[PDB]
Amino acid sequence: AFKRLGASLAFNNIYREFREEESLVEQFVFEALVIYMESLALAHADEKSLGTIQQCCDAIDHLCRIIEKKHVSLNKAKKRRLPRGFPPSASLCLLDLVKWLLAHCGRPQTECRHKSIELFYKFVPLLPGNRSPNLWLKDVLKEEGVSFLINTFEGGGCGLLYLRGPFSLQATLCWLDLLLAALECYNTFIGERTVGALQVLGSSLLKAVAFFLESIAMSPQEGERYNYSKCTVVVRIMEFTTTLLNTSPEGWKLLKKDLCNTHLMRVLVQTLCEPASIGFNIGDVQVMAHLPDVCVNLMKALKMSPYKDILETHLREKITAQSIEELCAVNLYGPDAQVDRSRLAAVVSACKQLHRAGLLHNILPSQSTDLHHSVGTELLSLVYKGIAPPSLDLSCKQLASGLLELAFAFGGLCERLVSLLLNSHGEYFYSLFSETINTELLKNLDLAVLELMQSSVDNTKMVSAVLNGMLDQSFRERANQKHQGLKLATTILQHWKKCDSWWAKDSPLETKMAVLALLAKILQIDSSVSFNTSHGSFPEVFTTYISLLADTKLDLHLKGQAVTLLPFFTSLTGGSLEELRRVLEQLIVAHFPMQSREFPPGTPRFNNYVDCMKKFLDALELSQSPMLLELMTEVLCREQQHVMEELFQSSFRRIARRGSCVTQVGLLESVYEMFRKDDPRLSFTRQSFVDRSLLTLLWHCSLDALREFFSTIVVDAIDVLKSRFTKLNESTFDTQITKKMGYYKILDVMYSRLPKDDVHAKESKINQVFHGSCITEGNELTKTLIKLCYDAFTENMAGENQLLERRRLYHCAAYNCAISVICCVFNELKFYQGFLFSEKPEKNLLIFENLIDLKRRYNFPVEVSTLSEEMSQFDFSTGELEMDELNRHECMAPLTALVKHMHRSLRDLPSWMKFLHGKLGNPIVPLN
C-alpha cells in the first residue's frame, strides 16, 4: 500500500511541469490515466485513513484538467502508444478511450465507479458531434444493441439458510458489492436523461432486490464488517427508487408488486421506529447523518404515486396514535430508566422525520374541535404536569425538549400556552424551559404579541420577564434572523397604548428602570431605521422618555442608560430640541458644581462626577452633534481647570476624524457662534473657548480639504482686526481685546497647517476673501494682516495703563500670528531685514520688549475574538526636554521652531544672529 503513494506524490510534483513540453504528452496520457485509475482500483479496500485515495484522486483530476485543455483541439488521429486493456490499433483519438470508460463503468470497486461516471459525464462533449448524453447514448445504442447496456450494467455479475445468520466469506462480500455496484450504475442515468426510464426497464435488478428483500432481516468480530457492507446498500436502494419515482412515472406501473409489497414498506417502518435492529446501530456518524434525508425523500417521492394508500396501510398499523397513547406511564422519574425512554426517543425522532416529510394529518389526522393535534395538546398537558409534585435529569430534559417540539410542530396551538402561563406556581415552567418556548413564540409573530400585551397590567412581572427573554433570545441569533428582530420591534412599537401605567407617575421605583432597560433592549436590538421620519410611535416613546427624566426617580447612575440612548434621540429639530436643552440644563445646573473640584477626591461623589461626565462623553463620542458639544463646553470652562482635562482633549481629537466633512465645519461654526455672539461673558470664558475648544479640532486632522472655514470667515473679522480700540470702559474694551486675540489665534492655527501653493496661488482662495475674482497677487490679505499685527506691539506702551496683563497676551498672540504668516509665506529671500526684525527706535519701537514682562523675577530652583463576542451577548443582557518657566511662556516654543526652520531653510547672519547679538552684546537691555 505504501508503494503507490510514491508514484502519486511524484505525479503531483511533476504535473505542473511537462505540460509545457512536446513529444511526451502525445503517446501515453491515456495509459497514465488508466494506470492511475487502475492503481485506484487496486487500492479499493486498503484504507481511507492512509490518505492514498485523496492523493490519487487529486492526481487524476489534476491530469484530466490538462488533457481537456488540449485534446479539445487534438482529439485527432496519430500512432499512439497502448494502454493496459486494449488491442493493438493505429489511431486512438478518443473513441476507444470513452468506450473503455463505458465498458469499465461497472467495475465493482467503489472509488473507481464514481470517478468513471463523473469522468464520462464531462468527457461526453469532445466527440466532434458535440452532442448531449440524451441523444448520443441512444444514437450509438440503436446500431449496437439495446441489450448491451444491461450487459454493461451487470458486468460479469448478471447472476442460503446458512447465511441467515450473516457471514463474511470472501465472495459473499463480492455478491453484495456487485448488488451495490449494479444498483449505483443506473442511478445517475435515471437521474439524468441519457436513456428512457423504460429503455432499460424494457429486470435482473428486480430479481436481485427481490432476493435481498427476502433476505434482509437476517465469527462475532468480523460479521459487523458484513453488517456495514450490507447496510451501505439499502440506502442506495432507497435512493434509486426515489430517483425512479420522482422522474417521469411511466414505470410507476412497471414497478410490479414483487418489490413494492409489505417488504419495502416494512423495512421503511423499521428504518423509522427503532432502526437499531436492522444494522443501523449507534456509533456511526456519516451514514447516521445521511439517513433521514433520503428516508424522508422516500416518503416525499411516494405521495405523487398511487402507493400512498400503501404507505397508510403500512404505517397506521405501526405509528398509530394508540402507540403514543399507550407509551405514556405515570411515574416518569424513578428507576424506570430507559424502557420507556429509548423507545419514546426513537418514536419522537420518527414522527419528527414524518413531519418533515409532510405527513402528520396524513398519517395521524386530528380530532374534534379544530386545528388541534389532540395528541400534541395532551403531550403539552403531560409535560406541564410532569414537574408538578419533582426531580430532574439531562436526558429527560432532552426527552422533554423533543417531546414538546413534537407537540408544538402541529400548528396554531401557542395561544393555549399563553393561557397556561399565568396563575413559583407557573413561572417555574418558563424557568425550566427557555430555549424552546421563545423560538416557538417567534414563529407565530404579529398575533402572539397582542395576546401577550392584553395580559399586561395584571401580571406585569412575568410579561416583562418573557419579553426580556424573547428579546435577548432574538439578539442571540441576530446574526441569523436579522428581519424577525426589526419586525418584532416595530410590532411592539405599535402596541404602546397598552402599557400606559408603566412610564407614568406614582409608580414604585422599580418599573421605571425596568421599562428603561426595556427601551435600551428594543432600541439597541436593531440599527437606526426604526427612529426617523415618522417611522412608528415616535412621539409617544419620545414623551415617555422625557417624563422618565423626572426628579422623584433615581438621581444619576441609571440615567447613564438614558444618555447612552441619546444617540438615537438626536436628529430632530427645535421644540423637541428646545425641550431637550431645557431638561439638560435642568440636570446640569442641579447636579454639577461650579468650582474646579468641590469634593474630596476619595468620596464616591467625585467618582460620580467622573461617572456622569464619562457617560456624557460616551454620548457625544459617537454622535457628532452641535448640541452636545456646547452642552459639555458650557460646563467645561466654568472653573479654570477641572479634573478630566485630558479626557476632553482626547475625545475632541476622536471627534476630529469621524466622517461627514459637511458637519465638521458645522460644529466649528456652532462653537464659533457660542464664542462670537453679544452676551454677558467673562474674558476668561471668552478666552478659553478659542484657547482650548476648537484648536484641538483644527490642530487634529479635521479635514485636509476643509477650506470652507478658511474662506468664509476672514472678511467677517478682518474689519474688527482693523477697527479702533475704543478705550472708554472696562467691560467693552476688554471684549474687543479678547475678540482680536481670538481672531489672532484662529489665523495662527489656520496658517499653521496650510500650504502655500493653494492659498498663494491665483485661485478661489483669494476670490472669497476679496470680492470676486479681483486683481491679486500672493500677499493681499497677508499684507494688511501683517500691517495690523505689526501695528500691534510696535506702538510704544508709554501712555498705556489700562489693562497690561491682557495686553501682553494681545501682543503675544499678534506676534504668533506674525510668525505663522512669515513661515506660511514662501520664505523667498531677506525680507527679514524689512519685517519681523529691526524695529526703528527713533519712533520708540520695540519687538521682544513688549511681550516679555520685565517686572517679575523667575525662581530658577536648585536643580530645576468570538469569545468577546459571546461575552458581549451577555453585555447586551445586563450592561522636547521639559517646560519649567521660560519654556512655559506660550511664545518661546514657536520661536525656537521658527529659528530651527530658518536653520533648515538653507560673517554672521544679519537680522537674527548679528542684530540679536547687538541686542545682547551690551547691557542696553535689562535682565529679564
mmCIF file with all atom_site columns, C-alpha atoms in Angstrom, residues 761-863:
data_model
loop_
_atom_site.group_PDB
_atom_site.id
_atom_site.type_symbol
_atom_site.label_atom_id
_atom_site.label_alt_id
_atom_site.label_comp_id
_atom_site.label_asym_id
_atom_site.label_entity_id
_atom_site.label_seq_id
_atom_site.pdbx_PDB_ins_code
_atom_site.Cartn_x
_atom_site.Cartn_y
_atom_site.Cartn_z
_atom_site.occupancy
_atom_site.B_iso_or_equiv
_atom_site.pdbx_formal_charge
_atom_site.auth_seq_id
_atom_site.auth_comp_id
_atom_site.auth_asym_id
_atom_site.auth_atom_id
_atom_site.pdbx_PDB_model_num
ATOM 1   C CA . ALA A 1 761 ? -1.925  80.615  -5.925 1.00 0.00 ? 761 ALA A CA 1
ATOM 2   C CA . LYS A 1 762 ? -4.236  82.565  -8.243 1.00 0.00 ? 762 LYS A CA 1
ATOM 3   C CA . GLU A 1 763 ? -7.373  80.676  -7.252 1.00 0.00 ? 763 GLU A CA 1
ATOM 4   C CA . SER A 1 764 ? -10.620 80.920  -5.255 1.00 0.00 ? 764 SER A CA 1
ATOM 5   C CA . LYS A 1 765 ? -8.617  81.134  -2.023 1.00 0.00 ? 765 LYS A CA 1
ATOM 6   C CA . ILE A 1 766 ? -8.402  84.816  -2.946 1.00 0.00 ? 766 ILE A CA 1
ATOM 7   C CA . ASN A 1 767 ? -11.831 85.079  -4.598 1.00 0.00 ? 767 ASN A CA 1
ATOM 8   C CA . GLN A 1 768 ? -13.699 84.764  -1.282 1.00 0.00 ? 768 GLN A CA 1
ATOM 9   C CA . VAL A 1 769 ? -11.569 86.931  0.996  1.00 0.00 ? 769 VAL A CA 1
ATOM 10  C CA . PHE A 1 770 ? -11.659 89.559  -1.740 1.00 0.00 ? 770 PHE A CA 1
ATOM 11  C CA . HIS A 1 771 ? -14.799 90.418  -3.621 1.00 0.00 ? 771 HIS A CA 1
ATOM 12  C CA . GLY A 1 772 ? -14.985 88.097  -6.591 1.00 0.00 ? 772 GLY A CA 1
ATOM 13  C CA . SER A 1 773 ? -12.049 87.296  -8.839 1.00 0.00 ? 773 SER A CA 1
ATOM 14  C CA . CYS A 1 774 ? -10.159 90.548  -8.248 1.00 0.00 ? 774 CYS A CA 1
ATOM 15  C CA . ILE A 1 775 ? -6.738  91.567  -9.449 1.00 0.00 ? 775 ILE A CA 1
ATOM 16  C CA . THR A 1 776 ? -4.428  89.951  -6.925 1.00 0.00 ? 776 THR A CA 1
ATOM 17  C CA . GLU A 1 777 ? -1.045  88.521  -6.016 1.00 0.00 ? 777 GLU A CA 1
ATOM 18  C CA . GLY A 1 778 ? 0.302   86.238  -3.314 1.00 0.00 ? 778 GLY A CA 1
ATOM 19  C CA . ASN A 1 779 ? 0.069   88.793  -0.487 1.00 0.00 ? 779 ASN A CA 1
ATOM 20  C CA . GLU A 1 780 ? -3.148  90.807  -0.466 1.00 0.00 ? 780 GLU A CA 1
ATOM 21  C CA . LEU A 1 781 ? -4.795  89.838  2.822  1.00 0.00 ? 781 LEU A CA 1
ATOM 22  C CA . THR A 1 782 ? -1.366  88.757  4.070  1.00 0.00 ? 782 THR A CA 1
ATOM 23  C CA . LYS A 1 783 ? -0.102  92.300  3.653  1.00 0.00 ? 783 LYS A CA 1
ATOM 24  C CA . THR A 1 784 ? -2.859  94.067  5.595  1.00 0.00 ? 784 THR A CA 1
ATOM 25  C CA . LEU A 1 785 ? -2.892  91.282  8.193  1.00 0.00 ? 785 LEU A CA 1
ATOM 26  C CA . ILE A 1 786 ? 0.868   91.783  8.554  1.00 0.00 ? 786 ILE A CA 1
ATOM 27  C CA . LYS A 1 787 ? 0.136   95.515  8.804  1.00 0.00 ? 787 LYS A CA 1
ATOM 28  C CA . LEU A 1 788 ? -2.363  95.120  11.633 1.00 0.00 ? 788 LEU A CA 1
ATOM 29  C CA . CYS A 1 789 ? -0.369  92.581  13.656 1.00 0.00 ? 789 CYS A CA 1
ATOM 30  C CA . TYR A 1 790 ? 2.682   94.806  13.284 1.00 0.00 ? 790 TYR A CA 1
ATOM 31  C CA . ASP A 1 791 ? 0.506   97.743  14.287 1.00 0.00 ? 791 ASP A CA 1
ATOM 32  C CA . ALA A 1 792 ? 0.171   95.637  17.385 1.00 0.00 ? 792 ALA A CA 1
ATOM 33  C CA . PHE A 1 793 ? 3.256   95.696  19.695 1.00 0.00 ? 793 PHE A CA 1
ATOM 34  C CA . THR A 1 794 ? 5.113   98.452  17.817 1.00 0.00 ? 794 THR A CA 1
ATOM 35  C CA . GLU A 1 795 ? 3.322   101.488 19.155 1.00 0.00 ? 795 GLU A CA 1
ATOM 36  C CA . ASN A 1 796 ? 5.024   102.039 22.490 1.00 0.00 ? 796 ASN A CA 1
ATOM 37  C CA . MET A 1 797 ? 3.211   101.473 25.779 1.00 0.00 ? 797 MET A CA 1
ATOM 38  C CA . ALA A 1 798 ? 4.046   104.900 27.214 1.00 0.00 ? 798 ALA A CA 1
ATOM 39  C CA . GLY A 1 799 ? 0.516   106.187 27.758 1.00 0.00 ? 799 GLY A CA 1
ATOM 40  C CA . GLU A 1 800 ? -0.785  102.648 28.258 1.00 0.00 ? 800 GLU A CA 1
ATOM 41  C CA . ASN A 1 801 ? -2.102  101.965 31.771 1.00 0.00 ? 801 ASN A CA 1
ATOM 42  C CA . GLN A 1 802 ? -5.488  100.345 31.100 1.00 0.00 ? 802 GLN A CA 1
ATOM 43  C CA . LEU A 1 803 ? -5.095  96.518  31.233 1.00 0.00 ? 803 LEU A CA 1
ATOM 44  C CA . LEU A 1 804 ? -1.497  95.400  30.935 1.00 0.00 ? 804 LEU A CA 1
ATOM 45  C CA . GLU A 1 805 ? -1.515  91.656  31.677 1.00 0.00 ? 805 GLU A CA 1
ATOM 46  C CA . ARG A 1 806 ? -4.039  91.025  28.905 1.00 0.00 ? 806 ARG A CA 1
ATOM 47  C CA . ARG A 1 807 ? -2.275  93.423  26.531 1.00 0.00 ? 807 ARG A CA 1
ATOM 48  C CA . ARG A 1 808 ? 0.809   91.244  26.973 1.00 0.00 ? 808 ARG A CA 1
ATOM 49  C CA . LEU A 1 809 ? -1.357  88.334  25.791 1.00 0.00 ? 809 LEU A CA 1
ATOM 50  C CA . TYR A 1 810 ? -2.578  90.521  22.911 1.00 0.00 ? 810 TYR A CA 1
ATOM 51  C CA . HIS A 1 811 ? 0.948   91.315  21.726 1.00 0.00 ? 811 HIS A CA 1
ATOM 52  C CA . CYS A 1 812 ? 1.934   87.667  22.201 1.00 0.00 ? 812 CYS A CA 1
ATOM 53  C CA . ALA A 1 813 ? -0.936  86.329  20.090 1.00 0.00 ? 813 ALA A CA 1
ATOM 54  C CA . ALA A 1 814 ? -0.327  89.018  17.472 1.00 0.00 ? 814 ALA A CA 1
ATOM 55  C CA . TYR A 1 815 ? 3.325   88.061  17.155 1.00 0.00 ? 815 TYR A CA 1
ATOM 56  C CA . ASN A 1 816 ? 2.216   84.416  16.984 1.00 0.00 ? 816 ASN A CA 1
ATOM 57  C CA . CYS A 1 817 ? 0.074   85.413  14.001 1.00 0.00 ? 817 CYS A CA 1
ATOM 58  C CA . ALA A 1 818 ? 3.062   87.308  12.593 1.00 0.00 ? 818 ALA A CA 1
ATOM 59  C CA . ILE A 1 819 ? 5.421   84.361  12.836 1.00 0.00 ? 819 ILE A CA 1
ATOM 60  C CA . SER A 1 820 ? 2.816   81.934  11.484 1.00 0.00 ? 820 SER A CA 1
ATOM 61  C CA . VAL A 1 821 ? 2.271   84.062  8.411  1.00 0.00 ? 821 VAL A CA 1
ATOM 62  C CA . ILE A 1 822 ? 6.007   84.625  7.953  1.00 0.00 ? 822 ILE A CA 1
ATOM 63  C CA . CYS A 1 823 ? 6.606   80.889  7.846  1.00 0.00 ? 823 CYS A CA 1
ATOM 64  C CA . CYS A 1 824 ? 3.456   80.235  5.798  1.00 0.00 ? 824 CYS A CA 1
ATOM 65  C CA . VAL A 1 825 ? 4.615   82.658  3.102  1.00 0.00 ? 825 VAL A CA 1
ATOM 66  C CA . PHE A 1 826 ? 7.069   81.383  0.505  1.00 0.00 ? 826 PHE A CA 1
ATOM 67  C CA . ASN A 1 827 ? 10.193  82.475  2.557  1.00 0.00 ? 827 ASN A CA 1
ATOM 68  C CA . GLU A 1 828 ? 11.830  83.820  -0.560 1.00 0.00 ? 828 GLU A CA 1
ATOM 69  C CA . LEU A 1 829 ? 14.865  85.930  0.459  1.00 0.00 ? 829 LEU A CA 1
ATOM 70  C CA . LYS A 1 830 ? 15.936  88.552  3.026  1.00 0.00 ? 830 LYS A CA 1
ATOM 71  C CA . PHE A 1 831 ? 12.549  90.095  3.719  1.00 0.00 ? 831 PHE A CA 1
ATOM 72  C CA . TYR A 1 832 ? 13.547  89.760  7.379  1.00 0.00 ? 832 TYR A CA 1
ATOM 73  C CA . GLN A 1 833 ? 15.503  92.988  7.036  1.00 0.00 ? 833 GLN A CA 1
ATOM 74  C CA . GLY A 1 834 ? 12.162  94.617  6.174  1.00 0.00 ? 834 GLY A CA 1
ATOM 75  C CA . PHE A 1 835 ? 9.736   92.861  8.516  1.00 0.00 ? 835 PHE A CA 1
ATOM 76  C CA . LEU A 1 836 ? 9.896   90.591  11.613 1.00 0.00 ? 836 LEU A CA 1
ATOM 77  C CA . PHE A 1 837 ? 13.106  92.318  12.829 1.00 0.00 ? 837 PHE A CA 1
ATOM 78  C CA . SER A 1 838 ? 14.886  95.685  13.148 1.00 0.00 ? 838 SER A CA 1
ATOM 79  C CA . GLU A 1 839 ? 12.416  97.959  14.871 1.00 0.00 ? 839 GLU A CA 1
ATOM 80  C CA . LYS A 1 840 ? 13.163  101.654 14.463 1.00 0.00 ? 840 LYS A CA 1
ATOM 81  C CA . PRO A 1 841 ? 13.667  103.107 17.970 1.00 0.00 ? 841 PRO A CA 1
ATOM 82  C CA . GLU A 1 842 ? 13.688  106.706 16.712 1.00 0.00 ? 842 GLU A CA 1
ATOM 83  C CA . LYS A 1 843 ? 9.896   106.425 16.902 1.00 0.00 ? 843 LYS A CA 1
ATOM 84  C CA . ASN A 1 844 ? 10.376  104.407 20.150 1.00 0.00 ? 844 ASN A CA 1
ATOM 85  C CA . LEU A 1 845 ? 9.662   100.929 18.816 1.00 0.00 ? 845 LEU A CA 1
ATOM 86  C CA . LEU A 1 846 ? 10.194  97.504  20.405 1.00 0.00 ? 846 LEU A CA 1
ATOM 87  C CA . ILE A 1 847 ? 9.739   93.851  19.453 1.00 0.00 ? 847 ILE A CA 1
ATOM 88  C CA . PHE A 1 848 ? 10.636  91.486  22.282 1.00 0.00 ? 848 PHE A CA 1
ATOM 89  C CA . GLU A 1 849 ? 10.438  94.124  24.991 1.00 0.00 ? 849 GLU A CA 1
ATOM 90  C CA . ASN A 1 850 ? 6.656   94.488  24.822 1.00 0.00 ? 850 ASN A CA 1
ATOM 91  C CA . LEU A 1 851 ? 5.665   90.854  25.341 1.00 0.00 ? 851 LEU A CA 1
ATOM 92  C CA . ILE A 1 852 ? 8.455   89.998  27.766 1.00 0.00 ? 852 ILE A CA 1
ATOM 93  C CA . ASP A 1 853 ? 7.199   91.091  31.169 1.00 0.00 ? 853 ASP A CA 1
ATOM 94  C CA . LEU A 1 854 ? 10.368  92.609  32.756 1.00 0.00 ? 854 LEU A CA 1
ATOM 95  C CA . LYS A 1 855 ? 8.507   93.029  36.097 1.00 0.00 ? 855 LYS A CA 1
ATOM 96  C CA . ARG A 1 856 ? 8.932   89.515  37.502 1.00 0.00 ? 856 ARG A CA 1
ATOM 97  C CA . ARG A 1 857 ? 11.996  87.602  38.703 1.00 0.00 ? 857 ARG A CA 1
ATOM 98  C CA . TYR A 1 858 ? 11.892  83.910  37.937 1.00 0.00 ? 858 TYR A CA 1
ATOM 99  C CA . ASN A 1 859 ? 12.768  81.374  40.607 1.00 0.00 ? 859 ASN A CA 1
ATOM 100 C CA . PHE A 1 860 ? 15.405  79.103  38.986 1.00 0.00 ? 860 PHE A CA 1
ATOM 101 C CA . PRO A 1 861 ? 15.412  76.422  41.739 1.00 0.00 ? 861 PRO A CA 1
ATOM 102 C CA . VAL A 1 862 ? 18.402  74.430  42.937 1.00 0.00 ? 862 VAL A CA 1
ATOM 103 C CA . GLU A 1 863 ? 18.423  71.822  40.156 1.00 0.00 ? 863 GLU A CA 1
#
